[model samples]
Target: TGPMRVFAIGNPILDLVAEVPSSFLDEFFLKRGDATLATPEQMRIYSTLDQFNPTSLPGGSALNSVRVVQKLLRKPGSAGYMGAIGDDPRGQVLKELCDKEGLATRFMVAPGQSTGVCAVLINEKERTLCTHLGACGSFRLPEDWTTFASGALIFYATAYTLTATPKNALEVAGYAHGIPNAIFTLNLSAPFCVELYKDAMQSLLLHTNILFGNEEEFAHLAKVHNLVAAEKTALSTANKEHAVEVCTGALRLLTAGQNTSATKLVVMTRGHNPVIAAEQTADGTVVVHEVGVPVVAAEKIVDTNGAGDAFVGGFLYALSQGKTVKQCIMCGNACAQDVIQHVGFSLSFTF
Candidate 1:
């Protein structure tokens, strides 16, 4: 990998947040609006955003992990996020904010439409949003798709992208298939994501380099894929580690022989327990490394915030940098350890 970038694709939601009176909605002709695409005419309402001074924050599960990579490297351009949007003010704001956070982007314009928006208008009593998925829902694989993914250090996607209706996500996965030295990654966001996207999940994981999931999600994945029986006694917690061991051997045997020639590592985490990194060698043997997590003082553990996603965020940073499996786990632990002691997802120490 002479020069490569960390790449991710997911739903792009720009919450154009503001505090507004009902009069504002009444004036805009947006009474209890249904979520729908915005035409150029309907989108004219954004000009009024200046009156409310709404904040635009680029929001996505994929973007969260990518931010960690950008922050850790101290170079924003090294990471790229591909998503669909339209030629509109909110779209521009989304891109600008991503840029400000060091996330370089490739945006696709949906012909004759506005980009996605969640008009998060709020007041004293309650908060409600006039939601429209907009162009982000109308995703299409770009003509120059190879620029971001063909030989990147890491090509990443969450389950949302994998199960997207447009089929663009699978198209991107096909492009990354069998690419030399390019690490392909996937995140199983929830147990329902496993059962719901089983067909697409099976297709993508055939060539996936590193697969990420929590203990529960992984268990669901095992059951969904028929790796283990549906019976509870067969897949219980006391023997869950064994379940992982058996699953690891079978998973590696099934996936490792696919288009991915590199060794495959299944990264699974149990809350506050050791991070299990099981790698599959070509010989059908699985080497499991239990990376112990650093203990945070009880008083210091402020929020769970699923501190585990931060584990994944930093883990990807290490993977992109070509760190060993154990090193990557510790790197994830380090990032997560610092984050839980604070109020939000942030690093207090020099990463």
Candidate 2:
């Protein structure tokens, strides 16, 4: 490779999105805008909803981020994805979709298993997801890890993947950490992941060069780590100024004892508010930057399913181009603004 490329590792899910009545939530015991894991029986029930004319798309938290990065960069082979899938029709569809999007895929297929699926039920502009891991949970690190690890400029994975494949995730991180110029990025995908896997995350942060999360997830991290003051500050309802301060404080606490030479960056996003980023200098000072969200018309907004993923996509693209932290945040805001006005995880217009 001319230069190291950007690679993302996580589960690969095929999203089946459909509109359902409010009654469906009651029947399925799911709340609006919440994501829950479904059992095999529940997945069987969800598979019969084609009468609503569901739309199928390739999806997964980290996979969505990688796809966005590939689209924005417009460079074939610049971005790659690694995950586990089943040797089924859904898996083939996912591979074809990645090929159409120009995203290189390194997938491990499990025989005699079905591909992972996420059923996205939309009601009144809100989405409720019921997911089945299926073959995604059986992920294991390949022996030839150095092929991808040594060729990556940045390697990213989400905490959600740790729920199913912690060992593989750690292996990816460990390998990336050995690469001198590579940046390792982690996303706190949800609050529960932080709460449940706090100890494991603490171990990973030592090698992580960049961390991404929302206010709630950061607050949970601070709380679990016993950073009481930082937790309260991060959760404050005060002005955007305090939000940046909160993010800075959380960053200081999170990377306090990390022994890595890498300059760490923490990016925190708040809905309809400013995005905050904290960069730790070599001198151990944390510098904060805040970028405002782009204004979008309320009437034009649709589903907000993958806004955070899109933001990370743009941010990663800017980072790869050696853009400043402020410019990266602005790029992320632009990406998020564009995706919220659409009905799916895709950008409405090409970059």
Candidate 3:
């Protein structure tokens, strides 16, 4: 193994994902063509998840992301996921998953709380999550930041965890700041995160070196009623001479501060219209690297829950190996695509 460090902090949940028939949709309020929150009836459908062809896997935004990154990097990189699990059987399962993935599991165990779980409902076109934060809600940073802040080059912290506690959120952010070589990558885990942890997020971003968001989260963060206007405002506000990559129809990169070069932005979409809009150097010159999404098909198509997390994992793994950003994105896309092809949130890898 080579020497690279990646620390991901978030909930560590045991995901039980089930694929129900399209007929299952009949019981719930389907808003014509939208993936909205599950109603009470919809929530009831998950009560029978255990009866389906259920697959249990270790999942959480940051955990899934780091898992993919570890598998992709193969050597010289160590993936560490910081979270707490109850002192129970499910906790053992979580530990085993991390061990099997070769991730450092030194800090995974916690006493008292039950291991958190997520019941993922998946249909042909979309996926929805019903999470029970459990022990993870009580997770906090080690008093000694040294356990995490040391020996890590990149840190990926998901906003989903902020819903649990503000102090915990700040603790992770402080860890990011303490690490000189670390670049903070924030995953806008959900649309509601912007409003729920606005102030805490702002403080975290001040130390963030990289930011990741989808169209929904970006719009919320910029507080724009209009999507386009929100996107522009977000880019303007995110300009800290740092790397801000937003994912919507495409991936856009914007550079903050007065860097002689123009702000680099990229917008990427999966499948339908994939293109790299902009690639600029530190000197302010934009290098246009264009490519079509790879046609690699996933072996199976079961659950799409952890696809994005896996993509982040794969992309970071590539980047840690000194690959170019474009290469990292492609690799990440490949990893995510592969995960989507399988059941549950687990990504399939040879190792």
Candidate 4:
């Protein structure tokens, strides 16, 4: 079958990225390389920085994935996003940005609310984010949700979105389950999400066909599910060979006792290290593959903010295009390598 349309659900934030002096961290009481939620006072403080050269883009975990997928696929109207924004100017800008990027939006504008904004403070090669989830926290699934049912081959969601709106997350899972042959994918956006929201994640995993996370997040999941001892024994040492074994074992544990006929793919990425993937065969055998990420010269890496999201973009695009598993991992690595060379979540050049 040919590739089908891609659809994503998440919170929407207007991202303002700018390089700042290292002193700005101390001034704002922020630690280097930490992503923290901003207080209203912090948002007011950042609002006064009109003199700085800031680039604003549509961003959010799942939205970033949606944009990159559209960028790689290069097909007009092939991808769509669902989120909530405020009835404010920033919201209008976000809608315009999505339109310009060729992503159809099913956005709900909340009255009397302010649009969410994320301030990305860059110091040399590192980015520290302070986000205000103004209107995004109130996002609800659209009433006419079945509109997302027709052409989408994959339904992707980020844990951040699920954390903010659990009802909507469950609704998304239910919708994906209703569609024939549709793949539901989830990204474990942050470690805190895994630690705090493991129950929700466990429920979602039952319906998820594809899962993405880093080593720490996967380890936490394994620990939560009482698979840590076996996972540790399977790991022995934390090398690529054992990493693949651990990942394969993790997939086997997550999919155990579920419908064995539905194949599941789990992809775990370690920064600057090889990416590992596990796919369950129809006969319930879990096969694992490891792909080395091409090295980008140290000086070429400008930022690592959304490298994982970019990787998912490329991987999902390839998967939707019916690429082989190895091809999918290679595509993901290429996208991650490309995004980290720039200062933001997106590629600098058109694909």
Worst 10 residues of 1 by lDDT: 31-40
Return the TM-score for candidate 1, rounded to 2 decimals: 0.76
Candidate 4 structure quality by residue, lDDT tens digits, 241-345? 666766776676557655466548889988888888888878767788888889888878777778899999998889888888889889988888888887678
Which candidate has the highest lDDT of all?
2
TM-score of each: 0.76, 0.92, 0.74, 0.92
In candidate 4, list every pair of residues with a backbone clash: none
TM-score of 2: 0.92
Per-residue accuracy of model 2 over 195-289 as CA lDDT, tens digit each? 88877888887667789998788777767776556536445733666567656656765467553556588899988878888888776677888
The window of 10 residues in a row where model 3 has the poorest summed lDDT is 241-250
Provide the overall lDDT of each model, using Cα atoms, as 2-decimal numbers: 0.69, 0.80, 0.62, 0.79
Cα error, candidate 2, residue 331 (Å): 0.9
Give the count of colliding residue pairs in each prediction: 0, 0, 18, 0
Q: What is the lDDT of residue 326 in candidate 4?
A: 88
Model 4 TM-score is: 0.92
